[PDB]
Coordinates of C-alpha atoms and ligand atoms in Angstrom, one line a residue:
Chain A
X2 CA 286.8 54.2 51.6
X3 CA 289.4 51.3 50.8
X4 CA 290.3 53.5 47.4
X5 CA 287.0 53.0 47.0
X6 CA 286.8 57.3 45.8
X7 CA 288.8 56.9 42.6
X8 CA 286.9 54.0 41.9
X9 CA 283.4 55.7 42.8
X10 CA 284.5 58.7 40.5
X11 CA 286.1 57.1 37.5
X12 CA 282.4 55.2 36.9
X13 CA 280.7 58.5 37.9
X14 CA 282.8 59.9 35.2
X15 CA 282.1 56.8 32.9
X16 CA 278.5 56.2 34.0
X17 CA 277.0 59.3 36.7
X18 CA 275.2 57.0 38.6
X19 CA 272.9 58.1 41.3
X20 CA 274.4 58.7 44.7
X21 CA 272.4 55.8 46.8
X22 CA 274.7 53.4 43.9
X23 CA 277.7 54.9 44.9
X24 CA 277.0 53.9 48.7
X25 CA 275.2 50.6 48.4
X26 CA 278.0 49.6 46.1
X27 CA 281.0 50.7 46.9
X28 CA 280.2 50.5 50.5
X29 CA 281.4 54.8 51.0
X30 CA 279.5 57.5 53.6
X31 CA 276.6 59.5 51.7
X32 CA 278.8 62.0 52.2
X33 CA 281.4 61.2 49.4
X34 CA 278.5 60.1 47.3
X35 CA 276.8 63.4 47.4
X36 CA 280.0 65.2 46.5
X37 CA 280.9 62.8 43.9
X38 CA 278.1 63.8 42.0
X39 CA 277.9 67.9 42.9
X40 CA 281.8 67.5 41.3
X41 CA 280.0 66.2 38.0
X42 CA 279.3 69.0 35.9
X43 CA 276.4 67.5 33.9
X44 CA 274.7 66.2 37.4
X45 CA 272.8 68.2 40.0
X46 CA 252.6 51.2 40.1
X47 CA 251.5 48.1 40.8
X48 CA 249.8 45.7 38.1
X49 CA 250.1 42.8 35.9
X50 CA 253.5 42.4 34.1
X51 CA 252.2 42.1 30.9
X52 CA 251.4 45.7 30.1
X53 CA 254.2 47.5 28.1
X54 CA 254.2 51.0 26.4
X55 CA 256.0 51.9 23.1
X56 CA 256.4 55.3 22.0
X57 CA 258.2 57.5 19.1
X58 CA 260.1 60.7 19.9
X59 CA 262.0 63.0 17.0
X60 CA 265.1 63.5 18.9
X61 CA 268.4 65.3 16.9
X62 CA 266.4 64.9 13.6
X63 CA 266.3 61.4 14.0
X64 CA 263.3 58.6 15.3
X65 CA 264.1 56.8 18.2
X66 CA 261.5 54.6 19.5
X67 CA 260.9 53.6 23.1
X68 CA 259.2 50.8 24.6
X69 CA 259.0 51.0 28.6
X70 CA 257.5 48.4 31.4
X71 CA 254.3 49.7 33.2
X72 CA 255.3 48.1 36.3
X73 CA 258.5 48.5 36.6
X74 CA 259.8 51.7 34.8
X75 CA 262.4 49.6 32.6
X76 CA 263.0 51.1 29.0
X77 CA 264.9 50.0 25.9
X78 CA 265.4 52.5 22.8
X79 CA 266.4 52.1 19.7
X80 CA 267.3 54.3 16.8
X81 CA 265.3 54.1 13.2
X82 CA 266.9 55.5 10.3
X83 CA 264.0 55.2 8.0
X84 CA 260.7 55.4 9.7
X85 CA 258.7 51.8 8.4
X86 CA 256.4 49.6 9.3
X87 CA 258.9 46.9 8.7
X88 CA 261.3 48.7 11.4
X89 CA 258.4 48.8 14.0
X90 CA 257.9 45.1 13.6
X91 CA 261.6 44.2 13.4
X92 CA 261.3 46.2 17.2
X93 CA 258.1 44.4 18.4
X94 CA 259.3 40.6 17.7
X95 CA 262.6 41.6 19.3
X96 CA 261.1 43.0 22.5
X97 CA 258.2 39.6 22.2
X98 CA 261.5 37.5 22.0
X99 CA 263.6 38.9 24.7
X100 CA 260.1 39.1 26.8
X101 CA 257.1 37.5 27.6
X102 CA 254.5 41.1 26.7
X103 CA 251.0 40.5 26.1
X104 CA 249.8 44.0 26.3
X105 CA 251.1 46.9 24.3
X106 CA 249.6 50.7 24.4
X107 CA 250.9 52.6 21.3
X108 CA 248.7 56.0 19.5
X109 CA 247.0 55.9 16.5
X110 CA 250.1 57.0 14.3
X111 CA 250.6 55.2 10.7
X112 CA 253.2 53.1 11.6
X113 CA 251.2 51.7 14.7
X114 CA 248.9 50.2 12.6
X115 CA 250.5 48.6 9.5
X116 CA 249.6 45.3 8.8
X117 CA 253.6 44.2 10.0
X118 CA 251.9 45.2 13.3
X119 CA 248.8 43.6 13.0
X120 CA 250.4 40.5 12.0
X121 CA 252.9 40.6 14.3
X122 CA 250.3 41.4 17.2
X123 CA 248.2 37.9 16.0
X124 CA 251.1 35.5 15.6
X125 CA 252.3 36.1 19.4
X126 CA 249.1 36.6 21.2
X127 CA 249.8 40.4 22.0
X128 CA 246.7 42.7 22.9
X129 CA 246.5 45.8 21.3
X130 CA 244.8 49.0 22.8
X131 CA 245.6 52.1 20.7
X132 CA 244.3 55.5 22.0
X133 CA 244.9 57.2 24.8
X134 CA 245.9 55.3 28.3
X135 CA 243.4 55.1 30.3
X136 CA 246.2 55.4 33.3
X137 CA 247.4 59.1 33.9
X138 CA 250.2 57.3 36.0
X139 CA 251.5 55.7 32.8
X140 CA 251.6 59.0 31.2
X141 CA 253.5 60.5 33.9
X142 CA 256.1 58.3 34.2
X143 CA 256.1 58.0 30.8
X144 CA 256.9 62.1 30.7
X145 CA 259.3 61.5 33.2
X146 CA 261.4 58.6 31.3
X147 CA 261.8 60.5 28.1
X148 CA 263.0 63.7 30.3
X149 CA 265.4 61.5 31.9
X150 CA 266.4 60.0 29.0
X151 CA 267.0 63.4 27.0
X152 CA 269.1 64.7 29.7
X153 CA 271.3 61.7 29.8
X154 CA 271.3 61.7 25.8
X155 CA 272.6 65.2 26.1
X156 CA 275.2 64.3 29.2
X157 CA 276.7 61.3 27.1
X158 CA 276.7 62.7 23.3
X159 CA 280.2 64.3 24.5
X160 CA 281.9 60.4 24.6
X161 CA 280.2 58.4 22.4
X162 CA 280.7 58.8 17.7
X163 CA 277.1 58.1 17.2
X164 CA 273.7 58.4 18.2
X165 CA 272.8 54.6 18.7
X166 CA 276.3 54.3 20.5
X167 CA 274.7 57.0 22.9
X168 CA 271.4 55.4 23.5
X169 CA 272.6 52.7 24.4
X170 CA 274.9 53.6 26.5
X171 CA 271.9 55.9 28.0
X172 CA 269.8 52.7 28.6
X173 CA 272.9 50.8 30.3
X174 CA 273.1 53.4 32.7
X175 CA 269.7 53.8 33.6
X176 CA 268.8 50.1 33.7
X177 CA 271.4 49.0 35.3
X178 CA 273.8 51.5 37.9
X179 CA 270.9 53.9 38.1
X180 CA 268.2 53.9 40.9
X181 CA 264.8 54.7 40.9
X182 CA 263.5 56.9 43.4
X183 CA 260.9 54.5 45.1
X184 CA 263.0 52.1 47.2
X185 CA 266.4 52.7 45.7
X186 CA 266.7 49.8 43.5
X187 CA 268.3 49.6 39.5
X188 CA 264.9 49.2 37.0
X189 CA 266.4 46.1 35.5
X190 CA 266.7 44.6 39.1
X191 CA 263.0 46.0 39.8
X192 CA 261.6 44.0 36.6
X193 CA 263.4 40.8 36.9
X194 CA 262.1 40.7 40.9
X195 CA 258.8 41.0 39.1
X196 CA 259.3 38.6 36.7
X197 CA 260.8 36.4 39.0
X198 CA 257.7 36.7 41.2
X199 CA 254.6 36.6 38.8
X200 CA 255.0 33.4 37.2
X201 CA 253.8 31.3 40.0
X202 CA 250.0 30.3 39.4
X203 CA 251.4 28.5 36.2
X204 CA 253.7 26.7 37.6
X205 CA 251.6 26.1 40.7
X206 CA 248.7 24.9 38.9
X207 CA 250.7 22.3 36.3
X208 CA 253.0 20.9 39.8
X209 CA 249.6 19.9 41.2
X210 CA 248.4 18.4 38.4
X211 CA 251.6 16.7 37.9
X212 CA 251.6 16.0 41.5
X213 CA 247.8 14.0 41.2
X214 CA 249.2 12.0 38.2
X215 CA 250.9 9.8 40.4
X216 CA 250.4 6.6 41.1
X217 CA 250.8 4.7 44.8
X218 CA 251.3 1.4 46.1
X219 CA 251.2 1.5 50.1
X220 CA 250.7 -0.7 53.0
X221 CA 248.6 -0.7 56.0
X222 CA 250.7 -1.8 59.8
X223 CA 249.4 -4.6 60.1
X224 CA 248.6 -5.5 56.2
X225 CA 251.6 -7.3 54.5
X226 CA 249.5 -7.1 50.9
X227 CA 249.6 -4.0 48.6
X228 CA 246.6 -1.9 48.2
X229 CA 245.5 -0.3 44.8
X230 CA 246.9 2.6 42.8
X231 CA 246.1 6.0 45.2
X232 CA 246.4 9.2 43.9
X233 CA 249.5 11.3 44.6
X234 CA 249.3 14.3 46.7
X235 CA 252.2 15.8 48.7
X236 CA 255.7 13.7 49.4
X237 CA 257.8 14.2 52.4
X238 CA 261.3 13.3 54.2
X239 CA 259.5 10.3 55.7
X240 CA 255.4 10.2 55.6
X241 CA 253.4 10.7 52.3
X242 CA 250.0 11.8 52.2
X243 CA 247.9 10.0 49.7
X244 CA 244.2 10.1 48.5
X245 CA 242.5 6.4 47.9
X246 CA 238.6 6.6 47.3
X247 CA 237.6 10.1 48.8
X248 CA 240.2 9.0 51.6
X249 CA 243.2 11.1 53.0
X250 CA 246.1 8.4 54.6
X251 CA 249.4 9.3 56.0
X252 CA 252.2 6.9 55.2
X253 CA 255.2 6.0 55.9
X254 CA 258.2 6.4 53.4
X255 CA 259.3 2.8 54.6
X256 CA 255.5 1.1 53.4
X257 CA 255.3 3.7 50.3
X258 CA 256.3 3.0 46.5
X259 CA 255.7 5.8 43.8
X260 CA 254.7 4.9 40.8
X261 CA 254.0 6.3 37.6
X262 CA 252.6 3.4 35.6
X263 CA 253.4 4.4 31.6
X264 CA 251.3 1.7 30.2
Chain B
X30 CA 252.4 -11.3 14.3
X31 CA 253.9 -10.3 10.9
X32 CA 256.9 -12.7 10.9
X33 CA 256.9 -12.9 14.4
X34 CA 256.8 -16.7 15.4
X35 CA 259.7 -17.3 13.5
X36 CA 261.8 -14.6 15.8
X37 CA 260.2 -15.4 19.0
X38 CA 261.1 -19.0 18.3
X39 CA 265.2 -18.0 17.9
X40 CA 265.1 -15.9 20.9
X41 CA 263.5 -18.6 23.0
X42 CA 266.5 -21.1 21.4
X43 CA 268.8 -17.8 22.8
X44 CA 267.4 -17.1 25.9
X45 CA 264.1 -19.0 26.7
X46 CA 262.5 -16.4 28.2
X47 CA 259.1 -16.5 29.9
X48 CA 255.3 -16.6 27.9
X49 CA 254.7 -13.0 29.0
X50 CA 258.5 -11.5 27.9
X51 CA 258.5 -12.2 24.4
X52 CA 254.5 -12.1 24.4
X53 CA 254.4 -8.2 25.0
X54 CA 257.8 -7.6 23.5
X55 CA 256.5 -9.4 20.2
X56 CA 253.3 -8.6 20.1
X57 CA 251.9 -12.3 20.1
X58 CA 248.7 -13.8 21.9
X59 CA 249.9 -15.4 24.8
X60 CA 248.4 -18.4 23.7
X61 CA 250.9 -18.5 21.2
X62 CA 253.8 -17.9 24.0
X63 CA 252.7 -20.4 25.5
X64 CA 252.7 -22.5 23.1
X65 CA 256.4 -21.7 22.3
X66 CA 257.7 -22.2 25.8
X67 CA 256.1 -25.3 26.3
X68 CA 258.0 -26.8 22.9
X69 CA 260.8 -26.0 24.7
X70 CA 262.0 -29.2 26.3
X71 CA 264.2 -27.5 28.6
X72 CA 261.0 -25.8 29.8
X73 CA 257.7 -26.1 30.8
X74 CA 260.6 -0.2 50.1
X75 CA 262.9 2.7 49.3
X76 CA 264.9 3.0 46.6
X77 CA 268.4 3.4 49.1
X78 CA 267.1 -0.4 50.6
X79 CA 269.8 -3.0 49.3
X80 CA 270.2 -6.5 50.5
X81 CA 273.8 -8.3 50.1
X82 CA 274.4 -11.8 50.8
X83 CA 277.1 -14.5 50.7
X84 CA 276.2 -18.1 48.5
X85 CA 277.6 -21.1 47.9
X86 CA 277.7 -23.1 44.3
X87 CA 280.1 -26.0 43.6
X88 CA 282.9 -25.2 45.8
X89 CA 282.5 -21.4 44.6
X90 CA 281.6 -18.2 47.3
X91 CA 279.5 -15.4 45.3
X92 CA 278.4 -12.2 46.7
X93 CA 275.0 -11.3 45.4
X94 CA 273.2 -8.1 45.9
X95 CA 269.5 -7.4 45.7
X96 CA 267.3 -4.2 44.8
X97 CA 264.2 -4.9 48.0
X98 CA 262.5 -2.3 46.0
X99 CA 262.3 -3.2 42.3
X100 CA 264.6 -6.6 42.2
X101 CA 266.9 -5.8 40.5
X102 CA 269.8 -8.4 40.9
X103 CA 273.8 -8.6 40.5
X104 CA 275.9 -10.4 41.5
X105 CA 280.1 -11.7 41.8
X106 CA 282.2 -15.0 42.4
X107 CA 284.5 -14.3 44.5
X108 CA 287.5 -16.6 44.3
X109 CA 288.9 -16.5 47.7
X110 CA 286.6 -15.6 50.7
X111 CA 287.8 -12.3 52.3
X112 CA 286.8 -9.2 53.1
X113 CA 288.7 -7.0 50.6
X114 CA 286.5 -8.2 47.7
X115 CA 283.5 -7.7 49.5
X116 CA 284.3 -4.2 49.8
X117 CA 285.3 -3.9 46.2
X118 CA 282.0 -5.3 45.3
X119 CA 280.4 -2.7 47.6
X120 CA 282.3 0.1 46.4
X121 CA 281.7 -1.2 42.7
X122 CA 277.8 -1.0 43.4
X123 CA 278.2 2.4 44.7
X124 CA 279.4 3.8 41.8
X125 CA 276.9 2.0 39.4
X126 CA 274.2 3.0 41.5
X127 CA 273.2 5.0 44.1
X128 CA 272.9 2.9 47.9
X129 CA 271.8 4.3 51.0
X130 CA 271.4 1.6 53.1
X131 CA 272.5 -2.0 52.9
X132 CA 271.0 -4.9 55.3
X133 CA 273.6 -7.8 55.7
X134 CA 274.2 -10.3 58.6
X135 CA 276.8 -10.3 61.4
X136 CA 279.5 -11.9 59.2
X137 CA 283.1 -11.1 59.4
X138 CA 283.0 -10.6 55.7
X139 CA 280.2 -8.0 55.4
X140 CA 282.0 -6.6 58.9
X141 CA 285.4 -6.4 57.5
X142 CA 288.0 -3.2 58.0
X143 CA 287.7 -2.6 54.9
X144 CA 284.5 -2.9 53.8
X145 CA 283.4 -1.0 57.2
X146 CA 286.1 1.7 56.0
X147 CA 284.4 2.2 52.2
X148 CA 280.9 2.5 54.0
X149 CA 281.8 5.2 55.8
X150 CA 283.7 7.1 53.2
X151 CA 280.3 6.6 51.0
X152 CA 278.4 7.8 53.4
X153 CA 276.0 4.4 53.5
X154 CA 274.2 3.4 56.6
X155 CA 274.4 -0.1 58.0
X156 CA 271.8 -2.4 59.2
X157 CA 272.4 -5.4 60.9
X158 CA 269.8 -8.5 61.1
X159 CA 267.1 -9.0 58.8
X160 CA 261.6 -9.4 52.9
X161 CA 264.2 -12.8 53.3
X162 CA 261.4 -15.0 51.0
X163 CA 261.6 -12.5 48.2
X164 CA 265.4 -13.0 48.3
X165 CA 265.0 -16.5 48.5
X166 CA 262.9 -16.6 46.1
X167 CA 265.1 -14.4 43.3
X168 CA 267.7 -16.8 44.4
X169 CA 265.9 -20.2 43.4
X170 CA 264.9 -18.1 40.4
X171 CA 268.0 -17.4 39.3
X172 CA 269.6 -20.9 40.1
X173 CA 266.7 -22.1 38.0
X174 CA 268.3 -19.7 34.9
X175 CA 271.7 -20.9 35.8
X176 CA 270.8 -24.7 35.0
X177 CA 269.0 -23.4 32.1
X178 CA 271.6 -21.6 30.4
X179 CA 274.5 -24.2 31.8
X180 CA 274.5 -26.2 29.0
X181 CA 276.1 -23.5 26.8
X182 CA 278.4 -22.0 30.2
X183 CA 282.3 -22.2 28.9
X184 CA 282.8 -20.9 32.4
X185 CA 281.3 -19.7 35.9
X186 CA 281.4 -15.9 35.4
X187 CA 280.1 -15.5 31.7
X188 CA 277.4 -18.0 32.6
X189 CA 276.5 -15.8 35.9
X190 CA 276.7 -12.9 34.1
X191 CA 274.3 -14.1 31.0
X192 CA 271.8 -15.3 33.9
X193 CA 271.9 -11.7 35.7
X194 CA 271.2 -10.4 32.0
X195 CA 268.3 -12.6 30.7
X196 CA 266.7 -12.3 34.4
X197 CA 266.6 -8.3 34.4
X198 CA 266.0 -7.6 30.5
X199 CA 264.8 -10.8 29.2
X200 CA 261.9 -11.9 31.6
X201 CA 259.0 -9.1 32.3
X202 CA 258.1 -9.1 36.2
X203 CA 255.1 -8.9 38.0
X204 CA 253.0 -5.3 38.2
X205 CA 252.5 -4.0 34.6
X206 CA 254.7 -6.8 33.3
X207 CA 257.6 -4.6 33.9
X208 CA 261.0 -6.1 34.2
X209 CA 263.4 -5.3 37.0
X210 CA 265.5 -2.5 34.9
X211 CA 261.8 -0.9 33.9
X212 CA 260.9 -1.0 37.8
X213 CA 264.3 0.4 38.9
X214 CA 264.3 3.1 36.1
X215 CA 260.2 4.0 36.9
X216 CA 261.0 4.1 40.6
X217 CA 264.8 6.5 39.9
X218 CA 262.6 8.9 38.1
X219 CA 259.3 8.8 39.9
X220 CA 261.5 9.7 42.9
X221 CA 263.6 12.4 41.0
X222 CA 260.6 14.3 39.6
X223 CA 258.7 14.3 43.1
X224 CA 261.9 15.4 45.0
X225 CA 262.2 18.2 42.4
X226 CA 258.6 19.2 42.4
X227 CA 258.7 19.6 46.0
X228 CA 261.7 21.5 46.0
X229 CA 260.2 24.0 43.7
X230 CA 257.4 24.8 46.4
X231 CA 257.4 26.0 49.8
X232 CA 259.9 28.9 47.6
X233 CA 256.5 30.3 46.0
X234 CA 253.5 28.8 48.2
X235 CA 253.6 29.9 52.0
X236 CA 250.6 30.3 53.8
X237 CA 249.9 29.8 57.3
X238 CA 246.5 28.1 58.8
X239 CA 245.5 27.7 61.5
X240 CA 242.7 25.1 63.6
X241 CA 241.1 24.4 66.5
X242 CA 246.7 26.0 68.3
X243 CA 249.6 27.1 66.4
X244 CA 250.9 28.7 63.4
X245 CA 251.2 25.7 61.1
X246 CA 252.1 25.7 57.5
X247 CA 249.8 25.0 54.6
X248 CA 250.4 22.2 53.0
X249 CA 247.0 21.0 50.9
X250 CA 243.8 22.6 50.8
X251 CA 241.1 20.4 49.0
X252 CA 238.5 18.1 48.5
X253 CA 236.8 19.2 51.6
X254 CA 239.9 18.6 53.5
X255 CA 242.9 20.5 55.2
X256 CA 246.2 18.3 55.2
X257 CA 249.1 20.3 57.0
X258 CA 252.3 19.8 59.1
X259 CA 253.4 21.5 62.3
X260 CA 256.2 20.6 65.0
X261 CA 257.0 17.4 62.6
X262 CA 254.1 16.0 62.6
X263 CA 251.1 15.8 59.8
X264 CA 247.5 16.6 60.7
X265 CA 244.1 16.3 58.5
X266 CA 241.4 18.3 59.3
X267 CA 238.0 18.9 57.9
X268 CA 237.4 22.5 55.8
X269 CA 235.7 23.5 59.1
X270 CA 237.4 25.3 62.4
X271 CA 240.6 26.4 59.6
X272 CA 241.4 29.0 58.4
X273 CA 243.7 29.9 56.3
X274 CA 245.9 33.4 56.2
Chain C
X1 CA 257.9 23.4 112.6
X2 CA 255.4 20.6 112.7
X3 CA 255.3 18.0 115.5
X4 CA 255.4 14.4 115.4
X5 CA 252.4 13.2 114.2
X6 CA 252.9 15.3 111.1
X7 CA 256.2 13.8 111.1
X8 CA 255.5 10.2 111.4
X9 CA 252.2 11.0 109.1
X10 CA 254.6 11.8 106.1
X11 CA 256.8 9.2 106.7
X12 CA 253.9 6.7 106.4
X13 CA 252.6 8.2 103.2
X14 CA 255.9 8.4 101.4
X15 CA 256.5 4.6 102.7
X16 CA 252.9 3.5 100.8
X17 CA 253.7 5.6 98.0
X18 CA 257.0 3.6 97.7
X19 CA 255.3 0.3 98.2
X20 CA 252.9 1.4 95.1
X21 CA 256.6 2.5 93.2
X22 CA 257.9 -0.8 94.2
X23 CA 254.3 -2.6 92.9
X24 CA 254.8 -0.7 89.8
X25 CA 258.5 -2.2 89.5
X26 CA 257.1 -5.6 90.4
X27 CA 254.8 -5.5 87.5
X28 CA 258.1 -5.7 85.2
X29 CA 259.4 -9.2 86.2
X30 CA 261.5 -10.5 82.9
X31 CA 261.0 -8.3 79.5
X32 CA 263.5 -9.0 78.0
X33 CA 264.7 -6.2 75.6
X34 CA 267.8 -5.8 73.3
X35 CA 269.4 -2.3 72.7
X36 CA 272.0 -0.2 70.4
X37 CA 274.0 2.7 70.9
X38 CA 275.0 5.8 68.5
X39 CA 272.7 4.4 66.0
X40 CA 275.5 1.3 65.3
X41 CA 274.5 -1.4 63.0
X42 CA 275.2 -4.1 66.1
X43 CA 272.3 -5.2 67.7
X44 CA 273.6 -5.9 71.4
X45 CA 272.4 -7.9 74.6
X46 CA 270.7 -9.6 76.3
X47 CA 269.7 -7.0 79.1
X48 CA 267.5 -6.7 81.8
Chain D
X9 CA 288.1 67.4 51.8
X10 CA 288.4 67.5 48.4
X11 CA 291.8 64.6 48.6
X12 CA 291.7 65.7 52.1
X13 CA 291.9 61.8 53.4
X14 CA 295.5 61.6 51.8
X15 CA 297.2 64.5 53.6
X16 CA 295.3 63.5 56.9
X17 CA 296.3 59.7 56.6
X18 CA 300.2 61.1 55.6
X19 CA 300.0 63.5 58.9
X20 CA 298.7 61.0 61.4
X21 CA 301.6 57.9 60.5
X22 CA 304.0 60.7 61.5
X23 CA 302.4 62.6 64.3
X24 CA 299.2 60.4 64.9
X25 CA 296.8 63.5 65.6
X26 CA 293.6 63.4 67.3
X27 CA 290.5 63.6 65.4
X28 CA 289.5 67.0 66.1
X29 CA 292.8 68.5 65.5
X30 CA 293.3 66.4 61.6
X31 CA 289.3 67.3 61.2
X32 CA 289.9 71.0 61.9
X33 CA 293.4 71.4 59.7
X34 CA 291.8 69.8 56.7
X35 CA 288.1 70.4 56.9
X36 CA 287.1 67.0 57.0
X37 CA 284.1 65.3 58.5
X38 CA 283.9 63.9 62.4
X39 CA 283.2 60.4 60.8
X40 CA 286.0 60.1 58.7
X41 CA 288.8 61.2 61.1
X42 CA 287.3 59.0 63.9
X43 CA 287.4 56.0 60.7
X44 CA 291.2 57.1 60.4
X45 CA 292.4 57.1 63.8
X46 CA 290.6 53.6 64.6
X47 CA 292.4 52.4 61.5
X48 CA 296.0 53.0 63.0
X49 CA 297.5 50.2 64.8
X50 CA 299.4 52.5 67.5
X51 CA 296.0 54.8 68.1
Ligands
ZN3 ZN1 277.5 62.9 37.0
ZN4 ZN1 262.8 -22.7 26.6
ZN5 ZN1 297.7 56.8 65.1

């Protein structure tokens, strides 16, 4: 409300974010939300990370192929002028670099399975499942995505000189200022919070390992003499607890030396 | 071995280390050390813990200071006995290494304004009265090195600071045969990589147990055994009457 | 309202409980013990 | 409504109207002409 309007509808005019943005961040009553985008003339599942979804859609006589996140609904498209193997591989160790996939569902077109693919597939560890998903949830939203995406294609042609410029700018908006309809939230937000929160066994797993490679010199309260290297468990502000022969001791931080002996 | 003797021989004519130093740094028998140092005719806690104290040499006051926790050892002649050096010393220290706590005596010196006043703005706690047969012990030591290496002394300081250098790189300690610098820089990074580790849990593991009371916090789950912490305090308990949510 | 008895009944009571307070002080005769305050370096004394 | 907010704010540093009466002469919403008379200093 502190000019926060003009704001609101020059990136509505720029962008035609949902409403729920406009309030959340531009901190404005629904109310000037909902009318922000009525004005606009071109407006009106849970699993493992790894599993991703890549597609290929004829759109405007040209091939545009789309990879989306099962778990979080986030897409990235890109435009192919001549449709190669070599293309769909360039697109495959791009999307492996920028993120950690190890499951892929594509159909059983030609381009699917080229030996780019194949090769690509073996040298990062993907998994590959052609046919048809086995989820009809996947499908769905998958339907839904390239709706979304067509309409927003045909909202934004108008601005940008080129189809990729378009596409782009379709994915920005959707990724990014756009939010989904289950909890409000931007799909590049939803992925990164999932992200975030599914690399933790890993880590969990190595820190304990770590954590039992120590080595530990302590000393009884009445013992003035050093006892013999016990294993490492769990460190604190001012008490360490410590396994020695099938033994858990507390200790002191004052009587305790950590170790890791390199030779 | 492979042209070895000849080298260990004009590094024990530099810095006559001990058997064990140029043993392991060589790779000789220690038979062979030995050997070597006996042709010699000149020879035959936490890591915030630090202990500073005031000597006396030939008509000369020098401020040494004392790593309780690995050994490490420096140390300063001060030229005229007052307070302001001290604090310099202290303040020196600081910025070489990282101090916590320092245990001194009730001396004026170690008491001074000033040296109170750079304390304080370092944020290091003081302790008053105080472990003492190690120090003594580092200080014969390094008395000991002092006569060694006097003969070739042009002055005090260079001779003081050549001792300091040949005790915490040229001799190997006790444990491991570890030197004071390896002790210090094991301890530094044992500490850094355990403080870190331990900062990168309770943000993804947070489970709550509970035995026999109250709501306490997980804290390792193993062996047949149930280590956790509640109210500030740390309890074991078998992997019976727990369970864990 | 109670009477005498109950008066001089209490009184008695709270004068042995005293004498066991004052048995319990007697147990301390010397212990000597040194003390700080606000966590100062200084060690101060002696005190009773 | 539709730039509504401007005229309203212009009115009430003059006159400093109620709420109903700058809700009712510009079509505006309850919420936003109680927002606009809280932020005057005078009212
Ligand atoms: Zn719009
Ligand atoms: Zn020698
Ligand atoms: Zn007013």
């Amino acid at each position: 409300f502190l000019d926060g309007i003009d704001k609101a509808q020059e990136e509505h005019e720029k962008y035609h974010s949902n409403w729920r943005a406009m309030a959340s961040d531009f901190n404005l009553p629904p109310v000037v939300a909902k009318e922000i985008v009525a004005s606009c003339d071109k407006c009106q599942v849970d699993c493992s990370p790894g599993i991703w979804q890549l597609n290929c859609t004829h759109l405007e006589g040209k091939v545009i192929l789309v990879a989306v996140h099962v778990a979080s609904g986030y897409i990235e498209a890109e435009v192919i002028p001549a449709e190669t193997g070599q293309e769909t591989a360039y697109f495959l160790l791009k999307l492996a670099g920028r993120w950690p996939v190890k499951t892929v569902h594509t159909n059983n077109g030609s381009n699917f399975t080229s030996t780019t693919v194949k090769a690509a597939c073996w040298w990062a560890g993907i998994k590959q499942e052609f046919g048809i998903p086995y989820n009809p949830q996947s499908q769905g939203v998958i339907e839904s995505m390239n709706k979304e995406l067509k309409k927003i294609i045909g909202q934004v042609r108008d601005q940008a000189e080129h189809l990729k410029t378009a596409v782009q700018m379709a994915v920005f908006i959707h990724n990014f200022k756009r939010k989904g309809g289950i909890g409000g939230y931007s799909a590049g937000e939803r992925i990164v919070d999932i992200i975030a929160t599914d690399i933790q066994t890993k880590e969990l797993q190595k820190q304990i390992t770590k954590i039992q490679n120590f080595r530990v010199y302590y000393r009884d309260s009445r013992d003035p003499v050093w006892k013999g290297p016990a294993k490492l468990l769990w460190k604190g502000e001012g008490a360490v607890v410590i396994q020695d022969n099938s033994d858990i001791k507390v200790v002191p931080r004052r009587k305790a030396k950590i170790i890791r002996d390199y030779g």
